[PDB]
DNA sequence: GTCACCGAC
């Protein structure tokens, strides 16, 4: 996720 | 986080 908690995705 | 397979903590 994010960053934080990438994306999704990448 | 939650998948797509990458991201970039």
Helices (H) and strands (E) in chain A, counts: 0, 0
Half-sphere exposure (Cβ direction) of A3: Cα atoms closer than 13 Å: 0
Nucleotide of closest approach to A8 (CA, C1'): B3
| Residue whose CA is minimally distant from B9 C1' | A4
Phi, psi torsion values for A2, nearest 5 degrees: 85, -110
Nucleotide of closest approach to A3 (CA, C1'): B9
| Residue whose CA is minimally distant from B7 C1' | A10
Name the DSSP letter for residue A6: -
Nucleotide of closest approach to A4 (CA, C1'): B9
Look-up of token digits 């999704």: A8
Alpha helices for chain A (secondary structure H): none
Report yes or no: A9 and A2 within 8 Å, Cβ to Cβ. no
């Amino acid at each position: 996720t994010x960053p934080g908690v990438t994306x999704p995705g990448v």
